[PDB]
Amino acid sequence: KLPPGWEKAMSRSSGRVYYFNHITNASQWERPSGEPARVRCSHLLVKHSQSRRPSSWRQEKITRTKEEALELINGYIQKIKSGEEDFESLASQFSDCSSAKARGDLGAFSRGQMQKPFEDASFALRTGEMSGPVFTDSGIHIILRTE
Ligand SMILES: COc1ccsc1C(=O)O
Ligand SMILES: COc1ccsc1C(=O)O
Ligand SMILES: COc1ccsc1C(=O)O
Ligand SMILES: COc1ccsc1C(=O)O
Numbered sequence: 001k002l003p004p005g006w007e008k009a010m011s012r013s014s015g016r017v018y019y020f021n022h023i024t025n026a027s028q029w030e031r032p033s034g035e036p037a038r039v040r041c042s043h044l045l046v047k048h049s050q051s052r053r054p055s056s057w058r059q060e061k062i063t064r065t066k067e068e069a070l071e072l073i074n075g076y077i078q079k080i081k082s083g084e085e086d087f088e089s090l091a092s093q094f095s096d097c098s099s100a101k102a103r104g105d106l107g108a109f110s111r112g113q114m115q116k117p118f119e120d121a122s123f124a125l126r127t128g129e130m131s132g133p134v135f136t137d138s139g140i141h142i143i144l145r146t147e
């Protein structure tokens with residue numbers, strides 16, 4: 001079987017299967033490898049006008065739309081996956097979370113502490129894996145599980 005959240009799917013690329021995780025929104029060509037009491041994650045948050053607090057250290061008033069936020073997230077993911085930029089450099093420069101100053105590190109946490117969509121994605125990632133866009137009331141996240 002595939003690990004939690006993962007499904008094999010048909011891409012629209014010359015009949016090639018890919019794998020998609022409906023908990024983390026990760027997608028990849030490769031079959032995924034393979035739950036802990038705690039995980040350690042970093043994240044990059046992009047807030048939008050419908051965030052719980054449309055404000056960050058980067059911008060006193062966050063006015064971008066949710067759609068615009070998702071396009072930003074998608075672009076960061078593209079740059080991370082291509083190697084053009086590192087997750088940590090992008091989090092430090094562009095995350096609307098205060099954790100940006102710590103390269104997005106949130107430390108370790110248990111189930112029952114974080115916003116549930118964030119928690120669920122985090123615990124479905126294996127160490128070293130990165131999520132796709134994860135939506136919470138804070139905004140849209142890229143999550144990297146580091147331990
Ligand atoms: C719109 O693009 C999609 C959607 C499902 S798979 C796929 C692809 O391009 O491989
Ligand atoms: C406790 O070990 C497990 C089980 C699935 S994920 C995972 C991990 O720690 O990466
Ligand atoms: C294309 O539409 C999108 C995309 C992300 S959010 C959103 C909306 O309509 O709010
Ligand atoms: C979660 O928030 C964090 C994490 C590291 S720094 C910081 C802050 O708020 O200053």
Ligand SMILES: COc1ccsc1C(=O)O
Binds near residue numbers: 043097106113118119
């Ligand atoms: C408690 O919720 C927090 C705090 C920092 S990030 C975050 C999340 O759910 O991702």
Ligand SMILES: COc1ccsc1C(=O)O
Binds near residue numbers: 066
């Ligand atoms: C996070 O997005 C939210 C939350 C409350 S309403 C809303 C929206 O997109 O309109």
